[PDB]
Design a protein around this ligand. Structure first.
Ligand SMILES: O=C(O)[C@@H](CO)OP(=O)(O)O
Ligand SMILES: O=C(O)[C@@H](CO)OP(=O)(O)O
Ligand SMILES: [Mg+2]
Ligand SMILES: [Mg+2]
Lengths: 437, 437
């Protein structure tokens, strides 16, 4: 029985406040920390921020914490909900808030309780968290599947000072045989890349962005990709390490066209690309580099350009801004054959039950699911247990640097050790990890 | 009763392997993780690395992990040790190794067992870790004293491009009335600094170094200190925020003299500073900036230069590489009146008991103690409970960015909340926090 529900303010990996929730039962005190989200936006669940400019640059979460303590807590404890019934927990929270976008109580207030309940449930059942999540999601557990980590190495776009328009460059050690080996070789490529970066671009280019990757002043996608391929080969892992991109092409979508020089104030509007033109740019990259996944190749509402490219892409295409972990938008992407993988952000929908459903609906359609971090992460390792419980075969949780990233990666090491012969590393089968063996 | 001792490799905040230990008792499984420094003092207890070029850039810890699993563990479990008696735990570990510098087993094999035993002890006693640590150290608990956080905000020296030789610039919110307030106001200064740095040095100078501070190409100490003052002012916290330095002067110490242009390959050797001249440099900075602490002002065995400066410094002078958390070296520094505060790094000495002794010897000489992280940190939060247990009034655990730093700062928020009226914030009284009330 849940005897107490409590929230406090703590700090995320960017140094902004976030909500931490503790649920107390007979098994002890169970803690979940919510990562950074969005307090504005057209489709997604909205976190609640205080907007008091004299505290935390306006980014306080006192109101959301108060909603947990004053509103959610007494009604939840009184309801005497079975924490093992995650659907009942979440139905209760969703109905209490009464808004689609969770803006009455705040998506951050809601998710804290949702996730803490699942930890209390695992303890009641005397099972590890990932096992309980497997139960909730009805995933196959003979064997379990460990994910390929899509490790951030380098950033461009809004997160860098060069002309480079594309946002994320990731390495995926699909050629490793275990998760432990995957993380070792990925880390080796990372350090080789960092040293090469400092040598070529200067010491400051070695400083890290929010998610632990470098951000030198790179001019072109080819420059970035040659550097990565060269670091892969220098580390001795050519053939075992593949590449993933996040184009975040909504960031350079202007008046129906795509501006690959959007950071240039005097960008030649005649150089701007149409849908088919940008697709050919990706085709050219795919010919020259071991790219196995591309995220947000076209803008968040440009459905026809996604559907067109998907006809011939022939690699995993990941929806992020297109879908925003939103069920109706996922359904649309599936119908329009716009992509074949969902970037899954638990806090973007705001409950565990709805996150699980979004993954299941993707899997039903033959899609992949890449479990995702946020920019403001925490020491909480929930998404590590979640990626295993959902059997997805792939996770994006940062570079092998900054411990809000390493906490998840280390947790995956532990889970692999624990499961032993009843788990396999997804490796080359990352896309359909859920159907592996 | 300890039934099992186990170790595994995990990753620190820089993506390098380190040792994680788990100790099992009737109360459960207790986990401690060993941190790792860079350019470590010559006198630190040995951090054992594998040196296999073909794995982790030679930085593996397989040998240290093996020392736990194959050597310490079998013996420890058969030794019938009472984990509550930390002195007995550490006496046992030290007798196994039989070397002054823990070079037989590795300090990174010994420390994780030392720490995990204290967590297991706290659990047996049904007390939070900080209370157990207060008991072990014979510290007063009525009230406990919460630390001023010395927040890394800007880095120079080998950590940055540009000419700036001094390594570390910290802010200390001494004028706050609670820990929660100190962290809030410190975070606001940090964000103001990020914005200013990006505005003046470019977007990429907003990227962070290993401990979460910015590391732009800065030319002089005055330029850096002026930037920090501008950030404090813009945040509105003039008068409540003080400054600490860690010069890490051993890094620029060249045969009797100090090279303040050490990143210049053609640095002018006639311009290198003597001990007395460097002391004058510090005195000049002290007159123009609210500096209340300077760490490693002189090199790790340059005793005369420490002693001279200390005669007139008149502010807290902190020994890090000089003392390496070693009671033998502390006694020398006390005798030579070289400094008046210890930077306490548990992994410099290798056991909890020796670390506690080092703190106690320091307090007995009327020194302060600043409990410290390493530049390579993890999701482990031990030092937050330690700084409260030891009643020191000051901790150095990073910028308020990167969760290997926030994990400690968040834990301190939780401790403050738990203690309520049972604790006081050290504030202006940080130096002698142990003697407060
Ligand atoms: O863009 C994203 O996918 C996330 C993580 O990088 O960023 P934010 O959490 O700021 O939306
Ligand atoms: O010099 C120090 O005090 C520490 C932390 O700033 O660095 P390292 O852990 O590398 O010794
Ligand atoms: Mg994206
Ligand atoms: Mg130091």
């Amino acid at each position: 029985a849940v005897s107490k529900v409590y929230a406090r303010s703590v700090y995320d990996s960017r140094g902004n406040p976030t909500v931490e929730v503790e649920l107390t039962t007979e098994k002890g005190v169970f803690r979940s920390i919510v990562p950074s989200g969005a307090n504005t936006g057209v489709h997604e669940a909205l976190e609640m921020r205080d907007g008091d400019k004299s505290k935390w640059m306006g980014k306080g979460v006192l109101h959301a914490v108060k909603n947990v303590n004053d509103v959610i807590a007494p009604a939840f404890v009184k309801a005497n909900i079975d924490v093992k019934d995650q659907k009942a927990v979440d139905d209760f929270l969703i109905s209490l808030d009464g808004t689609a976008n969770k803006s009455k109580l705040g998506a951050n207030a809601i998710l804290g309780v949702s996730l803490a309940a699942s930890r209390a449930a695992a303890a009641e059942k005397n099972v590890p968290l990932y096992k309980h999540l497997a139960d909730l999601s009805k995933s196959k557990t003979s064997p379990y599947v460990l994910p390929v980590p899509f490790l951030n190495v380098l950033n461009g776009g809004s997160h860098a000072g060069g002309a480079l328009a594309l946002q994320e460059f990731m390495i995926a050690p699909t050629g490793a045989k275990t998760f432990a080996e995957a993380l070792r070789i990925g880390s080796e490529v990372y350090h080789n890349l960092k040293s090469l970066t400092k040598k070529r671009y200067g010491a400051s280019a070695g400083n890290v962005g929010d998610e632990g990757g470098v951000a030198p002043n790179i001019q072109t996608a080819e420059e970035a990709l040659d550097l990565i391929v060269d670091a892969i080969k220098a580390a001795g892992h050519d053939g075992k390490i593949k590449i993933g991109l996040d184009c975040a092409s909504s960031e350079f979508f202007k008046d129906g066209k795509y501006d690959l020089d959007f950071k240039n104030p005097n960008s030649d509007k005649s150089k701007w690309l149409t849908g088919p033109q940008l697709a050919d740019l990706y085709h050219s990259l795919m010919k020259r580099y071991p790219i196995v996944s591309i995220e947000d190749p076209f803008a968040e509402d440009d459905w026809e350009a996604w559907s067109h490219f998907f006809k011939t892409a022939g690699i995993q295409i990941v929806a992020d801004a297109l879908t925003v972990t939103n069920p109706k938008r996922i359904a649309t992407a599936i119908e329009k054959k716009a992509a074949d993988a969902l970037l899954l952000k638990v806090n973007q929908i705001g409950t565990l039950s709805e996150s699980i459903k979004a993954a299941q609906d993707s899997f039903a359609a033959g899609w992949g699911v890449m479990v995702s971090h946020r920019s403001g992460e925490t020491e909480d390792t929930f998404i590590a247990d979640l990626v295993v419980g959902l059997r997805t075969g792939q996770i994006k949780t940062g570079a092998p640097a900054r411990s809000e990233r390493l906490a998840k990666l280390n947790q995956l090491l532990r889970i692999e050790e624990e499961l032993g012969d009843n788990a396999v590393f997804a490796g080359e089968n990352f896309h359909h990890g859920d159907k592996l063996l």
